[PDB]
Amino acid sequence: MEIQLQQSGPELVKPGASVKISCKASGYSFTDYIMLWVKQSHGKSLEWIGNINPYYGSTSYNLKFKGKATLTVDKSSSTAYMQLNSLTSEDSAVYYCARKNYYGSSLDYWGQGTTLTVSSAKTGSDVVMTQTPFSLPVSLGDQASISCRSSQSLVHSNGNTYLHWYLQKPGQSPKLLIYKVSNRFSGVPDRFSGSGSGTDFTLKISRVEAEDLGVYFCSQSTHVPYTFGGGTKLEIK
Ligand SMILES: OC[C@H]1O[C@H](OC[C@H]2O[C@H](O)[C@@H](O)[C@@H](O)[C@@H]2O)[C@@H](O)[C@@H](O)[C@@H]1O
Ligand SMILES: OC[C@H]1O[C@H](OC[C@H]2O[C@H](O)[C@@H](O)[C@@H](O)[C@@H]2O)[C@@H](O)[C@@H](O)[C@@H]1O
């Protein structure tokens, strides 16, 4: 098959109300993978909301969202839900669900996103990921190099380093490119290569083409809460 996460449609909701966004999983065994939710404010970086293990219904939240977001599942319909309460204009954003694997601790399949608009109208410190440059204008064909530095070592107890790279093309959800520093995800071209160790990581693109354009995000999942870099927009001069 093919794996799909299908989210409910755009929501226009009044301030103070609640909203419950759905994410229907197909193509894989729903209870065998953590489902994670992400907020993306129109400004652009990704923020972890929380995880749910659908087999148990057990949850973990980013402290920022604890008290605001509630994650549930319906196993019978292979559907994950995120409810947001006491909505204000600051909740207006795009929300993604994404499947998290165990072998890579990476977000391998993403929903298409749900846009929430909140309006009255009718129609241990967290680990910081510093990405540079924030903007990389290039000529087509150029080599491109993007750096990601973490405030703490990303080496996990098991000796692996859970640093990953995602590409979000214009108007799409993020997609996994590289997991665990240097491993190319299925279908990703050899022109992408990831390197680095400890706190310093690099993504290189050997010959940029149009399908590579968008915003790149590094992410770490060695430490809780999971965190993302601020993005690097790769675009043509
Ligand atoms: O760590 C030893 C166990 O490794 C596997 O289970 C470990 C975790 O791997 C899975 O991806 C998840 O299902 C986890 O819940 C699981 O604990 C298994 O091979 C297990 O038989 C080993 O004991
Ligand atoms: O060997 C390096 C460190 O490995 C473990 O901690 C690394 C990361 O593993 C955990 O999953 C999280 O607690 C992270 O916060 C943690 O740094 C530890 O054994 C640590 O003592 C080692 O220094």
Side-chain angles (χ1 to χ4, degrees):
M1 61 237 35
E2 293 293 335
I3 288 167
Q4 181 174 5
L5 284 57
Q6 178 67 23
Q7 299 183 222
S8 46
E11 298 277 0
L12 170 62
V13 184
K14 301 201 191 305
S18 298
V19 69
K20 184 183 288 203
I21 292 172
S22 68
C23 172
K24 182 166 179 91
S26 62
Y28 77 95
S29 179
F30 181 64
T31 56
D32 278 305
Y33 292 82
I34 295 308
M35 184 77 75
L36 180 149
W37 294 77
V38 171
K39 176 177 179 185
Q40 182 166 48
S41 289
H42 188 276
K44 232 234 138 40
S45 200
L46 302 173
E47 315 175 62
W48 178 57
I49 294 172
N51 288 358
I52 186 159
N53 182 329
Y55 184 92
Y56 298 105
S58 50
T59 55
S60 71
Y61 294 89
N62 191 338
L63 180 68
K64 177 173 179 166
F65 293 97
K66 199 182 318 169
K68 158 117 302 196
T70 303
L71 307 181
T72 55
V73 297
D74 181 5
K75 288 181 293 154
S76 69
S77 69
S78 295
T79 300
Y81 302 92
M82 177 171 65
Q83 179 178 332
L84 303 171
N85 295 313
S86 295
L87 289 174
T88 69
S89 55
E90 292 193 288
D91 298 314
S92 299
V94 171
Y95 295 88
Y96 296 100
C97 61
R99 189 182 84 160
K100 188 180 87 61
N101 59 53
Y102 189 103
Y103 72 87
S105 200
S106 58
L107 299 176
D108 51 9
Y109 295 88
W110 292 65
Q112 85 277 17
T114 296
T115 301
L116 173 62
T117 303
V118 182
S119 177
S120 286
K122 47 120 188 299
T123 310
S125 210
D126 295 354
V127 176
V128 179
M129 305 296 286
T130 298
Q131 242 180 278
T132 65
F134 69 86
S135 169
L136 184 49
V138 297
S139 294
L140 288 162
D142 289 354
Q143 186 182 322
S145 175
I146 298 174
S147 297
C148 182
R149 181 188 78 248
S150 57
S151 61
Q152 290 191 221
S153 173
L154 300 188
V155 177
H156 187 273
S157 295
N158 64 22
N160 295 329
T161 297
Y162 295 94
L163 175 92
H164 322 298
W165 294 95
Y166 300 93
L167 165 59
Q168 184 175 37
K169 295 185 70 60
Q172 293 184 17
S173 76
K175 269 83 202 63
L176 182 60
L177 285 188
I178 292 199
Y179 68 94
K180 286 193 302 169
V181 186
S182 59
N183 300 279
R184 284 179 279 274
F185 187 55
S186 180
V188 175
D190 285 336
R191 66 180 180 272
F192 293 94
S193 65
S195 61
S197 68
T199 62
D200 302 315
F201 304 93
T202 307
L203 175 69
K204 289 173 186 312
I205 309 176
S206 65
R207 175 179 178 264
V208 169
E209 51 185 270
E211 69 178 44
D212 305 329
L213 306 173
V215 179
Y216 289 81
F217 294 99
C218 60
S219 177
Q220 69 80 28
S221 57
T222 288
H223 308 263
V224 175
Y226 307 153
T227 53
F228 293 92
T232 293
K233 183 170 174 59
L234 183 71
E235 65 170 325
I236 300 309
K237 287 168 175 178

